[PDB]
RNA sequence: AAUCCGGUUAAUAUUCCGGAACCAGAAGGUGGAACACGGCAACGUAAAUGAAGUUGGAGACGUCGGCGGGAGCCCUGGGAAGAGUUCUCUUUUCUUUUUAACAAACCACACCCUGAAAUCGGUUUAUCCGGAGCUAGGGUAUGGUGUUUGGAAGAGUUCAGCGCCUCAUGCUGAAUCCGGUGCGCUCUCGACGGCCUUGAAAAUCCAACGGAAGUUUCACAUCUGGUCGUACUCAUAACCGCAGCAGGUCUCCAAGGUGAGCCUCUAGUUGAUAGAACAAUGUAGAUAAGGGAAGUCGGCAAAAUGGGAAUCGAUUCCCACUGUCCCUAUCUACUAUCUA
């Protein structure tokens, strides 16, 4: 498991073939965690506010399935 | 043992086929003096050495 | 009737002894009926099977009836010792030439108390 | 500071003490340091309405001691056996049957 | 070479399920890489050709002692939930309060650079280092470490309520927090100090020298991993003793208190034909008035708590002690008695 820090390069590892699935979770401390399944890894990116949390859910791919609080 | 060879495992399969009952059909044959078992082992009893 | 299964089997699903598990007197026939793992949890929603709480060791009384070394003394001793020592050279109240000279008298044990040791600071 | 709420709902229902009672009772066995009614500027206890006992402490103070206080009157009013004590949320206390 | 957590069965779990990883081998595609560079240096990087030949290291290793660190257990405070106590005092008493493998970054014994020391300095718990470079400053590397996160709360756990003829067994709220302490127990690590007998083998992996030929030792992705064992007991009943034999057996984990013993917590048993009555005898124990070895080949055994002086552990003596004895009596348990 990877601890992803930079928004675009979540976006490319989920534009890569290789990304299956993606888990939305919605932290006591109002922290999203958006955990993107790989082959290898599990990349999870923590994301403090609430609006880049929304901005983000709709620029996955729609193709990509989303889970909600996991 | 829990580490027993293939080769003691299947002389202890048959072991255990052997000693089981007698169908009763077989019994009610006719000029069929089996009645019984005459090779009834227990694990208690006589090991299989 | 035989309730040794179903108490096994209360016991592994409750995650504690045997001995723990309490399984109602006047329930006995629907106990009997529950014969798989799946039915012994419902007992266990239901409230039928019960498991006991633990006991206590009572430190309470523990408590009210509590109500050497000779290498650790100078373990711990020679440790303030020398760590007092040492940052009276950062704050400059004494040099390295002469506590060169006072950190081998802490070796022969001259001081027994580190306001002992202070007496010698304020004597040089 | 801390909110401690014990609610009187069920008790002014089932008339088994009224608020009144509950808030003589308090006064008369809070024993915050050790002394009945020194509860003082850090800790006021103000019921609002005849339904809950409500008590703001700028100090601390134990939900259980107020869980053990309630349940020392329910066992002078021979009532424990009725309704038991339970904690509906934090800082909040309520009596319930069995 | 390489796997952990939770759950599941009437019976299997590091094997099954869900999740999260690792190892080995094999080929390619995409992108970045170009017989490469930056740091005076202790070095470093996504890459940074290496045919043959030559070479070394890891693997590959005794025993004792102290020190410090970590992990789990134990102790303990504040808080939270549940249970016990109550006229009185007790913000009480008891139970519970968890974070795996695997990843990421950060983060001090050895070395180097500036420095050139004595006025000898630094400095170990346990006096060693240094003209073979001291102190100091700055870096270098192995970084279990924790410093946060992923795993991961969605798990597990403790509560409260609801859903309803009902295989309705799901649904909803919370909490699972903040610390302290160690000559404590177990496991383990590192710098050291001793005892010197200086302490196996291979595969595999790695590295260096080496100099024939004019995009991998990078990242991601893909495929595969055959075979056999796996239940149960490991014993006052599953092995061996003819036997469900008071015996014999290799080994791991091991709470608390009072202070080696006794009582318990978790866990596990209540197992061994039983009932009635205390005859004689016997076994096992204790107490005994006054005397104190008078017993016996003899202080055998108990009591003094065993001990004082002599002679060669033994002997003797004086003191001391006592049911050995005068002189037996009493009490308890078992057996014997009766019964199924």
Known sequence: ?70 | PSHKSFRTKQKLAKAARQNRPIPQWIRLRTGNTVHYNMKRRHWRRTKLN | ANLRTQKRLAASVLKCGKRKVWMDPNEISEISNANSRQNVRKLIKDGLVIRKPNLMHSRFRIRKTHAMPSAVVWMRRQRVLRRLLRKYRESGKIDKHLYHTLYLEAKGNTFKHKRALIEHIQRA | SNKYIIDATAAVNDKIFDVAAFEKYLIDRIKVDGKTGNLGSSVVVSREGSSKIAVIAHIDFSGRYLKYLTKKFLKKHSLRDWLRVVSTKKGVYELRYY
């Open chain 1, 1 to 70: 498991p990877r601890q992803i820090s930079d928004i675009k390069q979540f976006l490319e590892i989920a534009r890569r073939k290789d990304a299956t699935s993606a888990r939305i979770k919605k932290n006591t401390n109002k922290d999203v965690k958006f955990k993107l399944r790989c082959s290898k890894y599990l990349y999870t990116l923590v994301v403090a506010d609430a609006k880049k949390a929304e901005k983000l859910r709709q620029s996955l791919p729609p193709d990509l399935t989303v889970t909600e609080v996991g």
